[PDB]
RNA sequence: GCGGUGGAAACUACCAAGCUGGAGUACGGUAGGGGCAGAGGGAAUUUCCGGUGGAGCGGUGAAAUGCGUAGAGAUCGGAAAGA
């Protein structure tokens, strides 16, 4: 089990290949993660948004142990994995109380690596 | 062409004396990622240390090497580091 409060944030690394689908508490420790890969299927596949689809499904219909009704989903990074998990979870529709953004926004730290030149 | 000699004085040069628009300086402002030195800053990244949780994460045209049950990645906190 768990602390047993029905509000908690959700998480969604959406990758630029990969989407992962963790829920958690308040505090942050984790209840569910459930990613592309977890979802069965592997490869050029995973990331995709049915994949996004079916990740924030099977992610989000293992916590009805808690049911939980005040959701708070905190997104982060790009990719084709953002919009049809916000329509998975709306799908669900549980009370999802607002989704926001907390993707690293560098102020010019590192350099990032080579140009691909294909 | 060179030399001697007699004349001219506009131009170059010369002698002397003024002139200011050229150029500077003095003064008052004014704009600036001009330079150098000293302090201070916060995102981000990586690594380490903790709590969770358990099988992939990462990557690609598609894969694979890698990393991962010695608990990865994800998430929250704690430091440190350089750029």
Redesign the pocket.
């Given at each position: 089990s768990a602390r047993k409060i029905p509000k908690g944030?959700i998480?969604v690394?959406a990758?630029?290949?990969?989407t992962?689908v963790?829920v958690?508490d308040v505090?942050?420790?984790?209840?569910?993660?459930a990613?592309?890969?977890?979802c069965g299927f592997?490869?050029?596949?995973?990331?995709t948004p049915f994949a996004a689809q079916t990740a924030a499904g099977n992610a989000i219909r293992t916590v009805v142990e808690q049911g939980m009704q005040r959701a708070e989903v905190?997104i982060?990074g790009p990719g084709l994995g953002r919009d049809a998990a916000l329509r998975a979870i709306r799908r669900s529709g549980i009370l999802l109380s607002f989704v926001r953004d907390?993707t690293?926004?560098?102020?010019?730290?590192?350099?990032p690596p080579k140009k691909?030149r294909?």
């Open positions: 944030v998480h690394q990758s630029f290949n990969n992962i963790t958690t505090r942050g420790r984790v209840v569910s993660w990613s592309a890969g977890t592997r490869g050029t596949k995973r990331g905190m982060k907390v690293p926004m560098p102020h010019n730290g590192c350099r691909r294909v």
